[model samples]
Target: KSFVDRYKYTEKLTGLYAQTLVDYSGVANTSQKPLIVLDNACGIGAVSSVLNHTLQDEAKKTWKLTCGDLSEGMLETTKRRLQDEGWVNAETKIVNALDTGLPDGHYTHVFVAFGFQSFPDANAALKECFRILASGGILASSTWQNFNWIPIMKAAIETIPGNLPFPTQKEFIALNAGWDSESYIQSELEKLGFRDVKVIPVPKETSIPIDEFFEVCMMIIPYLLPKFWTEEQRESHEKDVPMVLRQYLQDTYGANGQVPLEAVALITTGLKP
Candidate 1:
């Protein structure tokens, strides 16, 4: 599922962030290829292809990609994507962000796509990024900004009231921390000796193609669905989930067999100087 293997969504946002870097960081586009970097909590490289596309260019000749992820599946994805994209210089290793052994003062720009909110210990991960940054390095990350989508997802869940397969709401809440505001992220980065903290709003509205959207849901909802219903509930919910979602999608976003949905992203950046 895309929820458990959320690299797809995160990769989209992270790719956007990479583009932002090119716009904001004059050094990356300078004659020399500044080290474009990335890190992940799950040890999977979901954004490798996306990042390579963003980084490859006429001026910059090489991408000194460094990755740390805890999941073998994630790293493999990153590896294959990078190789296929001809970003052959990429280096990926299985390691946790909260406790990585990578050398400090080694990277120019660092990225933590969307995994920090799920960190069992957020502070530890922040500190780890601080400890590993090169002098004056920049750090950027993304996280969900609100619970507005809950209503839409809940509607989908109700379609299978007794057949859900997910953890209790309370448990799910504990695992996902900062979803409301940018204050927590700013404060944490400051505590880790980062400066020039700036938060940017990134809003995206995507039109869903019926078939592709269906495929996406099959991949995206599995991880979070389990958090909302038991396995049996999920079975019953599945029967009507698509129908309910389609109705809701049509009523709310329908146009020529397509639905428009908007997502809000918080892009927080800081300097390691």
Candidate 2:
């Protein structure tokens, strides 16, 4: 519920990321059967929104779409938006990516976007996706390779009262349970019997006002922080983080209050053998 309200900006933020996935996957090409798609852990249905716009026109009669998320609130929001947009025959479900209750060999395509790294068990989720895919099905997903905010966040950590040890970028990666190496992801997918595994780096840079960036950071701090922090510490950090971040941006970037943020993401695809 909080996520849906807090990160409503993601629909606009994720447009390019989602469109890149749709185009790179070549999903517009027709298949033998109606393209059955599962947007797993589909936060606000970014991938689904892109797919709906791209494939819902000519393929309207042949496309079967389902949007799944762990949060029912998020799914409801997605459904509401899709309905408002005139997307029909789409269903929503509360799904755990590690074990989606849907039947095996049911979907022709599974698209997972930024939510893949946050899964409780990514390998298990991958296996479950494999199980649900029909023969020759394609599974496509994206995960962060690098987010430029880590150092700025560490700087903010130093301003808090407690001498809390700020986690490094590598530690942050492990905390999110993300695989930064493309070869490693490819090996894991191949081990699971997926063929033609491809991992493509999608690097992006954007400039935004410090205030806008701060707002995004505030929204995601709960998910990014280590769980060991005490409630008092968290409250204090929240109070202090924004001021510290503002100073850091001004000192490091300029008085203009605009800073460039870089994100390197891996867009991976694999075909069921």
* TM-scores of all predicted structures: 0.61, 0.70
Query: Native-vs-model 2 lDDT?
Result: 0.76
Candidate 1 backbone clash number:
25
Clash statistics: count for each candidate: 25, 0
Q: Best-fitting candidate, measured by lDDT? A: 2
The reply for model 2, stretches above 4 Å from the true place, is 1-15, 148-177, 207-252
Whole-model lDDT, model 1? 0.61
Q: Candidate 1 at 271: error in angstroms? A: 0.8
Model 1 spans > 4 angstroms off: 1-27, 31-36, 41-47, 56-63, 147-179, 206-260
Q: What is each predicted model's overall lDDT from 0 to 1?
A: 0.61, 0.76
Model 1 lDDT at residue 98: 80
Best by TM-score: 2
Error of 1 at 154 (Å): 16
Error of 1 at 89 (Å): 1.6
